[PDB]
Design a protein around this ligand. Structure first.
Ligand code: CLA
Ligand code: CLA
Ligand code: CLA
Ligand code: CLA
Ligand code: CLA
Ligand code: CLA
Ligand code: CLA
Ligand code: CLA
Ligand code: CLA
Ligand SMILES: CC1=C(C/C=C(\C)CCC[C@H](C)CCC[C@H](C)CCCC(C)C)C(=O)c2ccccc2C1=O
Ligand code: SF4
Ligand code: SF4
Ligand code: FES
Ligand SMILES: [Cl-]
Lengths: 41, 64, 74, 80, 74, 74, 749, 97, 124
């Protein structure tokens, strides 16, 4: 598992984890007011 | 200009115009472009070195 | 015919002479006040000529013959 | 016919001559580089314009340039 | 219909004329531009830093496109 | 004018900017770029410079007026 | 061990995962530019380039096949799990005429649960058009627990399939002599895969599906039905349904087969209750084709003397041993083709892709007209989706067949191997083939499409007596009309006395209507059908022209005599000889992808409009059929304007007026497909040098901020820009039609 | 530290010369009183093709040798990286074509 | 205002409730500016000055964070760190990327944010 960590640091794996980690704002856009206009926060 | 000197290219048609490359070897055979300069950045054709004259080079680092 | 009522009359560009029309297309391209198939003008030259003084077909013909001769001059 | 021009940045690597499908190019003695050779293009009436010679050239910029010119039946590559 | 046709007519003619303006600006720089008669003047000074002009047109284009398309899609 | 006008004006801004990008890029890179330094020796309209150096399709300055005609039309 | 054919190396290492490009020698160099990133996925599966031994490539292919089977089992497990947890399968089982199939619910997120539409019975979900419910009803499923069991079994099979692919490569991989045993493979696939598979399914049908469907058609509620094993267990319960099961398996061995004629029927029509085919007739079909395929599997000599050798049969098919008019193939014939097909994987893949795509198209054309599942024909969204999906899969597979026929040419073709045989003789007159294909494409393009243009001009002139209509110049397809008449005369109480009904009601016969809606009725063939079939012939022929041209001139042509030295996927050979852009075989696969799109799109449009105006509808109490668009195919589908107005403008009412409804995702995807189509044209019309010169200015702006990156940013290559444009065009243009079809069929039924 | 032995039929001699890991054989051959054929020193020709009799060289910068041509033993001595020493043939451009 | 808008109440008192129209039609109507179609219009006035700062100014921070993490990771590099993101140097350029606003004005005055005209490659 020496290079298994290195393969998990590759460009596609960092890409997919970055998209799902920044895109998990599902819980941020459902926890409080799923509709948030410009002048309402 | 001798081996190891970082040089800036003064050739307008070169891929590495105004770029720093390391001198690999200078030819003392009296040819038109004796200096071989090698670059860390490859050109479009896939080539990272080229022969230049001494008149189209500017030394930016004396070799240590 | 259009200077008398320039709001309820469609200006006409020229006439159609397509021999391949059926009578249903000859009737469709014939308006109420015309005896042949025509094209409705959408270039606005009727409004322009009416705003600059041109009132009759003789005026239009005189202008056309002047421009024919002016093209010959050029 | 196309115009194939060879410039003094040539290093006599022969790769343009080897890449020519129509035998336009050959090597001639030069003593202007340390290989002692430079390309030449005498049979440029045969040149089709594929620019394989330019793809094969290692110098930056190219020591060989093809300028597509008047089209003949040979430069259009027509077997009819 | 005349008003609409006239506006669309002249705006398309204008877009073509603006396209040919830059066409012949390129043909001038190919055929007639003299780099020594124009040494270090405004024309040769804009040819020098042309990457700044092209990258900033690229930035304005990218900003406008991302924002307008994303506002429409939202 | 209202909110639906602001978006379409920004779309028109995007369109004029990208058309200007294509035309300015092809005019300023007409005499030569890094991919083809001697582009002024090949003319205004020429197909390409072959498949060497990665490929040089639509590299001429004429191809910029080509590529910006689509954007002008859009 | 049991056949002494394994002992494979390639130890299961982990370190070989953090070194992308390990397969290619230049891919494991060190990136440098960005073209390497795209080159990584351009030939990742091309095991032919990686190594040179046929045996190592064969082993890799075998294990890749196992991994693919695992992926398909994961997909099947997911579909059965969706039908067992997020579906209204039980509700649809109760009422399959008033309940809409649904197997997908959306989470309550931003505006998002509007896509959960009312499916009947209080179920808020998305209406699936995959035909899973109609398939599970016909197979014998009644409750969701059985679906859950099938999902678990498919997941177990997926794990087993990924162990068989690791064990047949990393532990005990076969030798090349095992892969080259085409006789044994054909024997086993014909007798054990197809033969025994359909025999086992016939056993399932006779003991599970036929019982359950008979009770379902009788009127029994789905959870009032016995489970399948009771049908298997006690013969009294099964003999209540069929009186031929009272004599057990005795009439079969004593050859009294007409005893069994009540569950092996040969009716040949549609069940009036469900709308699907007669289930007993289906079981009899599977019994007959099991007997046929098993018997076909004993054809090829394997280890026992009896059989054929395919090499002998291939080498004897040659002049002067042929039919006298077929003797033009010369005295070598098919001599070197057994060594072509047992040493080239690409030759086999080309044949198998052509047959697989053709068979998928045959599946599409046989399941709208002979609906094989209960309550399938009346769900018009499912019928539309199944036909359209299988036509697209078939077209893509057929394009890949030509792709690999061209890869065989550049790589695996050997002139010395196959001399003066059929393959050599085809390459030795390909100008005749291609020029005659050019002429037939032109003849078909004038005599299909320019007749539509004639009709447009005549209809705009106001002279419809001059049109190619059924009221103008009639163009009746008399041969297909005669075949339809022969098909409806054959089934009389004749030439097929055994069958009662016609093989489909599409040929003739009567009308099957189920739940008010039409299951199937005769498809009348008039002048519009003549015209659209010649459109189909024309588009298929130009697709064949584009693809066959690249296959035949993949080696060389009169322009570039050494095209095989340039490769299979190369952009051009420079601007010389006039400009040799897109001369490769790959570029012909590129240009044939567009032509397959244009061909299959018109097939699915013909199907949608013709079935929607002349078959599908709503039968009233009396029997009068009110078709969906109202029989307007015979007069509007003969001009291009009627295709744009009465099909595209009129039937896209349901997809653009879908905002705010539960079909709003279809309107969103309709617009998205238009975006992706238009975005493709950026890659298709533009070239590579513009983008590389614009990236120069962007790199300058980056160098000035000192945000320079080591991997040097380069524009997409010429063939990669072509591939990206083609993929985007196909994706957007097919997503558009998908949204249009599915929004239309989920709103007007 | 590595030892590379250059063999040439014309010269009919086997002279060994140590080469640094991060250094091209040809480049290291110039700093050891040894003549060799070389034109471009970039890996875009075949002028310094040296068949490898034994050992292994790091020629990842080379961009001209074919997959089947690099398996024979040929390795551009101009853009090659001496991993150890072993031995390599010189002036083998006539054997390439 | 949206509270007193006569056309904004015909989407108030006839709409699905759910959890996308009930806890969103309020705070919206309290603090928005609707026109005549019953639709909130994003205004740019003195009251919006402390309203549009939280979309505009707080996006600038995260965008500069991404741009400065992509900078500080990439100056300390060499063609394998873009393929295989070095998580340690990534965390080092994230920790410095947090307070990138200060570092950015500590580069322009020092002259190490911009490169010289003769130290950047150009074209003919
Ligand atoms: C087979 C189909 C067909 C054919 C052959 C025609 C033929 C014709 N139509 Mg017709 N039309 C058709 C279909 C057809 N139509 C249909 C289906 C309809 C709907 C019912 C119509 C409706 C229609 C109308 C309303 C009119 C016609 C007219 C005409 C005539 C015009 C040509 C002419 O006489 O002057 C000769 C001029 C030419 C042949 C010029 C064309 C040649 C060049 C390439 C174009 C011009 C040069 C240049 C490129 C363009 C200028 C610069 C540009 C960039 C701006 C011609 C006989 C017109 C007419 O009657 O004229 C008196 C008329 O007004 N048609
Ligand atoms: C719908 C079709 C479409 C789209 C979206 C684009 C988009 C673009 N073009 Mg293009 N173009 C097109 C058709 C299209 N073109 C056609 C048919 C031609 C004729 C060949 C051209 C020729 C052309 C040229 C010659 C150039 C462009 C340029 C551009 C880019 C600059 C504008 C911008 O930044 O906006 C913002 C970006 C977008 C709108 C892209 C969409 C972003 C997606 C949706 C993000 C979400 C993705 C995720 C998976 C979901 C942009 C990516 C110019 C350029 O590169 O500027 C730097 C450039 O010089 N275009
Ligand atoms: C082709 C394979 C496939 C596809 C396209 C899907 C797709 C989906 N699944 Mg599924 N699933 C699959 C296979 C698949 N699954 C398999 C093999 C299993 C195990 C038997 C599951 C078990 C599963 C569960 C438990 C759930 C999903 C759910 C979902 C939905 C959302 C998933 C998500 O948000 O992340 C989505 C439509 C979620 C869902 O449907 O939300 C209501 C959810 O709860 N799936
Ligand atoms: C009767 C014996 C038998 C059976 C059932 C199979 C079945 C199969 N073979 Mg095999 N084969 C056999 C004998 C058999 N083979 C012999 C004797 C040889 C040597 C000449 C081969 C050489 C061979 C090769 C080289 C390949 C196959 C492949 C396949 C799979 C084809 C995938 C498919 O089309 O649908 C898939 C249907 C699936 C139904 C379900 C999976 C069924 C499992 C695997 C076995 C069922 C057990 C059953 C009770 C018996 C398939 C599962 C291809 C493959 O995909 O590799 C994995 C392939 O590469 N076979
Ligand atoms: C190939 C798959 C297959 C399998 C696993 C079975 C299995 C079975 N069948 Mg069978 N069956 C099959 C195909 C199959 N059948 C076909 C193709 C026919 C048409 C001739 C039949 C006609 C048939 C009859 C008439 C009977 C069976 C019966 C049976 C059951 C035991 C009786 C017996 O074996 O004798 C048994 C579970 C007996 C039964 O009903 O047991 C429940 C029974 O009498 N089958
Ligand atoms: C049994 C089916 C099958 C198999 C085993 C193959 C196998 C292969 N094909 Mg192939 N092909 C097929 C069907 C198949 N194809 C079909 C149906 C088409 C028509 C589209 C093609 C057209 C085709 C071309 C033009 C080429 C290949 C190539 C290849 C080889 C390398 C594939 C690769 O690079 O990695 C995998 C590649 C990807 C995963 C790319 C995926 C990106 C797609 C386009 C997006 C999909 C959109 C999504 C579904 C939504 C490989 C041996 C390449 C080759 O060089 O052969 C030696 C090659 O140039 N194929
Ligand atoms: C509507 C757009 C359009 C049209 C009309 C065509 C037409 C044609 N394509 Mg094409 N194609 C298209 C779009 C189109 N394509 C697109 C979008 C692509 C993108 C991938 C391609 C890619 C493509 C390929 C790769 C090939 C073709 C081929 C052909 C030719 C087929 C042979 C034929 O049908 O004969 C009949 C001619 C027509 C149907 C053209 C219209 C004729 C009208 C209806 C009659 C005109 C009447 C009269 C002559 C007018 C005279 C008036 C006078 C004043 C001049 C044909 C000329 C194939 C070919 O060469 O076949 C041999 C070929 O291989 N196409
Ligand atoms: C030309 C095409 C044609 C085709 C596709 C068929 C097809 C068929 N015929 Mg048939 N038949 C034909 C011509 C044809 N027939 C002619 C010209 C005659 C003389 C009038 C017959 C007289 C005939 C009889 C008496 C029977 C069939 C039967 C059958 C069916 C059983 C399959 C089989 O025979 O083995 C099958 C669907 C059998 C059947 O109807 O299935 C029960 C059967 O009883 N045929
Ligand atoms: C973290 C790395 C990084 C950083 C700090 C920058 C920074 C910058 N880029 Mg950039 N770029 C990047 C990566 C990066 N880029 C990548 C990966 C691509 C390929 C998609 C691009 C393609 C690109 C283009 C075409 C342009 C810029 C431009 C710019 C400048 C201002 C406009 C802008 O940011 O939005 C643009 C950002 C993108 C188009 C994509 C970047 C998003 C990644 C994920 C970050 C700015 C200094 C513009 C410029 O030249 O300024 C005058 C410009 O025209 N970039
Ligand atoms: C637009 C276009 C390009 C430019 C397209 C490029 C350069 C590819 C665009 C992909 C971008 C650059 C994605 C790569 C960005 C990084 C992967 C970072 C992404 C961020 C994620 C990790 C989150 C071509 O190169 C081209 C070539 C030939 C014909 C037509 C065209 C063409 O139309
Ligand atoms: S390829 Fe270029 S450098 Fe080599 S001989 Fe030909 S012109 Fe000279
Ligand atoms: S594909 Fe591109 S590089 Fe090749 S000949 Fe055509 S335009 Fe030139
Ligand atoms: S000297 Fe040219 S590649 Fe070696
Ligand atoms: Cl019509």
């Amino acid at each position: 598992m020496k290079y298994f960590a290195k393969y998990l640091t590759s460009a596609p794996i960092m890409a997919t984890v970055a998209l799902v980690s920044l895109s998990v704002v599902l819980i941020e856009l459902n926890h409080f007011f799923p509709g948030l206009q410009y002048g309402t926060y | 200009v001798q081996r190891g000197s970082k040089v800036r290219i003064l050739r307008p048609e070169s891929y590495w115009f105004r770029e720093v490359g390391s001198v690999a070897s200078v030819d003392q055979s009296g040819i038109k472009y004796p200096v071989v300069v090698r670059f860390s950045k490859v050109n479009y054709a896939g080539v990272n070195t080229n022969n230049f004259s001494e008149a189209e080079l500017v030394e930016v680092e004396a070799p240590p | 015919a259009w200077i008398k009522d320039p709001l309820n009359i469609s200006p006409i560009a020229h006439a159609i002479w397509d021999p391949q029309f059926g009578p249903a297309a000859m009737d469709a391209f014939t308006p109420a006040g015309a005896g042949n198939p025509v094209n409705f003008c959408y270039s606005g030259v009727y409004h322009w000529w009416y705003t600059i003084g041109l009132r009759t077909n003789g005026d239009l013909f005189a202008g056309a013959m002047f421009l024919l001769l002016l093209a010959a001059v050029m | 016919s196309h115009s194939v021009k060879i410039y003094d940045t040539c290093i006599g690597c022969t790769q343009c001559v080897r890449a020519c499908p129509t035998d336009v190019l050959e090597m001639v003695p030069w003593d202007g580089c340390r290989a002692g050779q430079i390309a030449a293009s005498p049979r440029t009436e045969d040149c089709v314009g594929c620019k394989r010679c330019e793809t094969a050239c290692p110098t930056d910029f190219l020591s060989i340039r093809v300028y597509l010119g008047a089209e003949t039946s040979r430069s259009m590559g027509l077997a009819y | 219909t005349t008003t609409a046709a006239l506006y669309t007519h002249h705006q398309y003619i204008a877009g073509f004329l603006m396209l040919g303006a830059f066409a012949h600006g390129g043909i001038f720089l190919i055929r007639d531009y003299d780099p020594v008669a124009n040494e270090n003047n405004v024309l040769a000074r804009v040819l020098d830093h042309k990457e700044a002009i092209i990258s900033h047109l690229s930035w304005v284009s990218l900003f406008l496109g991302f924002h307008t398309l994303a506002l429409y899609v939202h | 004018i209202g909110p639906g006008d602001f978006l379409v004006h920004h779309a028109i801004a995007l369109g004029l900017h990208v058309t200007t990008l294509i035309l300015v890029k092809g005019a300023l890179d007409a005499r030569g770029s890094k991919l083809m330094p001697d582009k002024k020796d090949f003319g205004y309209a020429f197909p390409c410079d072959g498949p060497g150096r990665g490929g040089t399709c639509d590299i001429s300055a004429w191809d910029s007026v080509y590529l910006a005609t689509f954007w002008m039309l859009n | 061990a049991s056949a002494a054919t394994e002992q494979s190396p390639i130890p299961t290492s982990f370190e070989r995962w953090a070194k992308p490009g390990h397969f290619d020698r230049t891919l494991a160099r060190g990136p440098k530019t960005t073209t390497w990133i795209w080159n990584l996925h351009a030939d990742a599966h091309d095991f032919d380039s990686h190594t040179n031994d046929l045996q190592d490539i064969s082993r890799k292919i075998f294990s890749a096949h196992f991994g693919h089977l695992a992926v398909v089992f994961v997909w099947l497990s997911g579909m059965y799990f969706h039908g067992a947890r997020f579906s209204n399968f039980s509700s649809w089982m109760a009422d399959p005429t008033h309940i809409r199939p649904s197997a997908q619910v959306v989470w309550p997120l931003v505006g998002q649960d509007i896509l959960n539409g009312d499916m009947g019975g209080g179920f808020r979900g998305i209406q699936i058009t995959s035909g899973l419910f109609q398939m599970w009803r016909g197979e014998g499923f009644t409750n969701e627990f059985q679906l859950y069991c099938t999902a678990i079994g498919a997941l177990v099979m997926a794990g087993l399939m990924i162990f068989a692919g690791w064990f047949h490569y990393h532990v005990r991989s076969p030798k090349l002599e095992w892969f080259q045993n085409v006789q044994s493979m054909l024997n086993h696939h014909l007798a054990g895969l197809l033969g025994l598979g359909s025999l086992g399914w016939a056993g399932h049908l006779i003991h599970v599906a036929l019982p359950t469907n008979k009770l379902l058609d009788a009127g029994v509620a789905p959870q009032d039905i016995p489970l399948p094993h009771e049908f298997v267990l006690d013969k009294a319960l099964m003999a209540e349904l069929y009186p031929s099961f009272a004599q057990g398996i005795r009439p079969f061995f004593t050859l009294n087969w007409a005893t069994y004629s009540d569950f092996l029927t040969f009716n040949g029509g549609l069940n009036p209750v469900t709308g699907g085919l007669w289930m007993t007739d289906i079981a009899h079909h599977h019994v007959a084709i099991a007997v046929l395929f098993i018997f076909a599997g004993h054809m090829y000599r394997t280890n026992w003397g009896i059989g054929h050798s395919i090499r002998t049969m291939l080498e004897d098919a040659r002049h002067p041993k042929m039919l006298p008019f077929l003797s033009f193939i010369g005295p070598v014939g098919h001599r070197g083709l057994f060594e072509v097909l047992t040493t080239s994987w690409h030759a086999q893949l080309s044949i198998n892709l052509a047959m697989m795509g053709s068979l998928s198209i045959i599946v599409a054309q046989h399941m709208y007209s002979m609906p094989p599942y209960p309550y399938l024909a009346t769900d018009y969204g499912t019928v539309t989706s199944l036909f359209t999906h299988h036509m697209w899969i078939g077209g893509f597979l057929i394009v890949g067949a030509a792709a690999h026929a061209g890869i065989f040419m550049v790589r695996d073709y050997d002139p010395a191997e196959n001399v003066n045989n059929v393959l050599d003789r085809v390459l030795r007159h390909r100008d005749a083939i291609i020029s005659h294909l050019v002429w037939v494409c032109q003849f078909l393009g004038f005599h299909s499409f320019a007749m539509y243009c004639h009709n447009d001009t005549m209809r705009a002139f106001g002279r419809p007596q001059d049109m190619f209509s059924d009221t103008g110049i009639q163009l009746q397809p008399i041969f297909a009309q005669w075949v339809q008449h022969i098909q409806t005369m054959a089934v009389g109480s004749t030439t097929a006395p055994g069958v009662a009904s016609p093989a489909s009601y599409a040929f003739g016969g009567g009308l099957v209507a189920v739940g008010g809606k039409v299951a199937m009725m005769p498809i009348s063939l008039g002048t519009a059908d003549f015209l659209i079939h010649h459109i189909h012939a024309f588009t298929i022929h130009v697709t064949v022209l584009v693809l066959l041209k690249g296959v035949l001139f993949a080696r060389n042509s009169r322009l570039i005599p050494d095209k095989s030295e340039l490769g299979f996927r190369f952009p051009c050979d420079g601007p010389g000889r006039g400009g040799t852009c897109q001369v490769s075989a790959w570029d012909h696969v590129f240009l044939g992808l567009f032509w397959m799109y244009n061909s299959i799109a018109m097939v699915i449009f013909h199907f949608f409009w013709k079935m929607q105006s002349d078959v599908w509808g709503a039968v009233d109490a009396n029997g009068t059929v009110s078709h969906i668009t109202g029989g307007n195919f015979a007069q509007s589908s003969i001009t291009i304007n009627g295709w744009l107005r009465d099909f595209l403008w009129a039937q896209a009412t349901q997809v653009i007026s879908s905002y705010g409804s539960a079909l709003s995702a279809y309107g969103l995807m309709f617009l998205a497909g238009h975006f992706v189509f238009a975005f493709s044209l950026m890659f298709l019309f533009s070239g590579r040098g513009y983008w590389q010169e614009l990236i120069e200015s962007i790199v300058w702006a980056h160098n000035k901020l000192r945000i320079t990156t080591a991997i040097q940013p380069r524009a997409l290559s010429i063939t990669q820009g072509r591939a990206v444009g083609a993929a985007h065009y196909l994706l957007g243009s097919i997503v558009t039609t998908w949204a249009f079809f599915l929004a239309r069929m989920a709103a007007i039924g | 530290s590595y030892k590379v032995t250059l063999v040439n039929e014309t010269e009919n001699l086997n002279t060994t010369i140590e080469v640094a890991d991060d250094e091209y054989i040809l480049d290291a051959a110039e700093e050891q009183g040894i003549d060799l054929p070389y034109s471009c020193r970039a890996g875009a020709c075949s002028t310094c093709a040296g068949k490898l009799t034994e050992g292994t060289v790091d020629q990842s910068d080379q961009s001209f040798l074919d997959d089947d041509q690099i398996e024979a033993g040929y390795v551009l001595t101009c853009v090659a990286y001496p991993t150890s020493d072993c031995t390599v043939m010189t002036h083998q451009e006539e054997e390439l074509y | 205002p949206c509270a007193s808008s006569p056309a904004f109440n015909e989407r108030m008192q006839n709409a699905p409730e759910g959890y996308y129209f009930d806890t969103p039609y309020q705070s919206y109507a309290a603090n928005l500016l609707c026109g005549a179609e019953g639709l909130p219009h994003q205004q740019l006035r003195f009251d919006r000055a402390i309203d549009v700062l939280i979309p505009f100014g707080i996006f600038f921070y995260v965008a500069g964070f991404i741009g400065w993490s992509g900078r500080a990771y990439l100056i300390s590099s060499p063609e394998e760190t873009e393929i295989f993101i070095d998580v340690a140097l990534a965390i080092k350029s994230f920790v410095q990327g947090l307070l990138w606003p200060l570092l950015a004005v500590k580069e322009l005055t020092t002259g190490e944010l911009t490169a010289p005209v003769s130290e950047v490659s150009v074209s003919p």
